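Whiteboard transcription, Tuesday session. T.W. wrote the structure tokens on the left side:
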């Protein structure tokens, strides 16, 4: 009772700004069974009906929604979506939960695979987020007001009351320090190291109304609306261009940092990891995930094997462009 996975959707026909908070996409409250998770973007899209409102969707639905709702760039959408799906989705039913585990993704895969959703900590979701607390403290998915207060503080201190690139640079480093000091299991390597810098600029490039073209900066009201209430600002117009992680290099430059983590279940004991992916060694990330998938799926056969092969190729198509050329791996051979 499986599905044949379609290739990834391409870019939208129209790539300009438009009203996305419109009559066909109203904010609605959560009903019982509806799933939300650590991504404010996907949360908002589900709560406006760009995604299924229950928070379970196909990879193709996620790509279309991120493009339609926010003008997320096509390749960035492919890289993030199939990463999330390979690690956390059900490859047979072609369904991914944007939060925790649910029967809505269908019959479970064979362990060690889990199809447990974007909430699963360790390989995609990780530490030193802006509005979510590290998993060590007990909840890696819920909005956290204490962290949002720090968001506001840093915006007051560095951005005249608004979130801009200067704020992003300072906040990213401070949050890393918070975790070093307080989380003995703190990890900041591989996937998390790369995705964390991109996440800090998404509020600027995607959450700021697209009619704003000079001095792009996010108000705390708009930040609260998306990060906490999963709601587009009134009359929200998406980015006038497809966009992703522009400026992430500047965030790293403001406080140069190396992948690693706290060693030996001890705080204030951050050790570099020289084998981790970084921004000049991106193909390492590709290989780490192919390997993680091999751990989840040690001996797949049948429809599962087929869908794995397809989804792996789909992910490579995005990664190849985004990382500037990586040799494709074939852990389960070819079709
Ligand atoms: C995110 O948000 C933040 C917040 O909104 C934003 O910050 C702004 O960033 C810009 C720069 O990008 C800031 O503007 C710059 O300010 C520099 C520092 O200003 C001080 O020093 C000036 C130079 O000193 C001379 O004069 C003093 C005596 O006053 C003397 O001791 C020195 O020896 C020296 O001779 C000084 O002129 C300036 O005072 C003026 O401005 C203040 C207000 O800031 C005003 O109260 C004064 O009356 C007076 O008008 C101040 O004391 C400054 O050096 C710098 O100038 C360069 O650039 C301009 C053009 O941009 C050139 O004309 C000039 O020749 C220099 O090359 C520039 O003006 C701005 O102040 C920040 N705003 C805030 C609120 O912090 C970030 O940019 C945002 N980040 C992103 C990524 O967007
Ligand atoms: C919302 O998110 C926040 C931020 O993550 C959560 O709050 C944190 O909760 C943890 C767990 O209780 C706190 O951890 C402890 O912090 C000590 C350091 O405190 C200093 O620094 C912080 C900021 O960096 C200041 O707030 C604080 O006043 C101090 O100046 C550590 O020394 C503690 O270590 C002990 O426990 C660990 C774990 O068992 C051991 O490994 C250590 O050896 C040691 O015994 C500890 O880590 C943390 O301080 C909190 N941070 C903040 C900023 O408040 C919220 O719980 C979360 N939920 C909510 C409330 O919405
Ligand atoms: C394309 C598919 C997407 C996937 C699979 C995805 C997945 C994730 C995951 C798993 C996290 C949590 C990582 C963490 O902080 O621990 C996350 C965080 C985040 N995502 Fe997404 N995301 C996607 C698209 C988007 C889009 C389009 C935006 C913006 C419009 C966005 C904005 C964010 C932001 C800002 C965070 C950080 C939240 C915080 O630190 O408080 N994402 N995403
Ligand atoms: Mg996190």
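and on the right, the sequence the group agreed on:
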């Amino acid at each position: 009772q499986g599905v044949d996975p379609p290739p990834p959707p391409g870019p939208p026909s129209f790539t300009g700004t438009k009203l996305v908070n419109d009559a066909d996409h109203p904010w609605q409250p959560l009903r019982e069974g509806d799933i939300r998770g650590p991504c404010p973007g996907l949360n908002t899209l589900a709560s406006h009906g760009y995604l299924p409102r229950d928070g379970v969707a196909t990879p193709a639905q996620i790509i279309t929604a991120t493009q339609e709702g926010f003008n997320f760039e096509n390749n960035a959408a492919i890289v993030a979506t199939y990463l999330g799906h390979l690690l956390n989705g059900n490859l047979v039913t072609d369904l991914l939960s944007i939060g925790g585990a649910t029967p809505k993704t269908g019959p479970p895969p064979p362990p060690p695979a889990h199809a447990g959703g974007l909430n699963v900590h360790g390989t995609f979701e990780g530490d030193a987020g802006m509005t979510r607390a590290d998993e060590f403290f007990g909840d890696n998915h819920s909005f956290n007001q204490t962290l949002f207060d720090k968001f506001v503080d840093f915006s007051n201190r560095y951005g005249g009351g608004f979130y801009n690139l200067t704020v992003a640079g300072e906040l990213r480093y401070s949050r890393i320090q918070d975790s070093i000091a307080t989380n003995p299991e703190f990890q900041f390597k591989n996937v998390r190291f790369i995705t964390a810098y991109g996440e800090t600029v998404f509020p600027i490039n995607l959450f700021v109304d697209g009619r704003v073209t000079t001095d792009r900066k996010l108000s705390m009201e708009d930040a609260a609306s998306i990060f906490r209430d999963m709601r587009f600002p009134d009359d929200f117009h998406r980015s006038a261009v497809p966009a992703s992680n522009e400026g992430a290099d500047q965030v790293l430059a403001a406080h140069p940092w190396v992948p690693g983590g706290n060693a030996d279940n001890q705080v204030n004991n951050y050790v570099e990891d020289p084998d981790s992916a970084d921004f000049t060694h991106l193909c390492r990330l590709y290989e780490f995930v192919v390997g993680s998938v091999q751990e989840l799926y040690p001996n797949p056969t049948g429809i599962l094997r087929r869908n794995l092969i397809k989804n792996l190729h789909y992910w490579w198509t995005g990664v190849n462009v985004a990382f500037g050329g990586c040799d494709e791996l074939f852990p389960y051979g070819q079709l």
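Someone added at the bottom: The radius of gyration is 19 Å.
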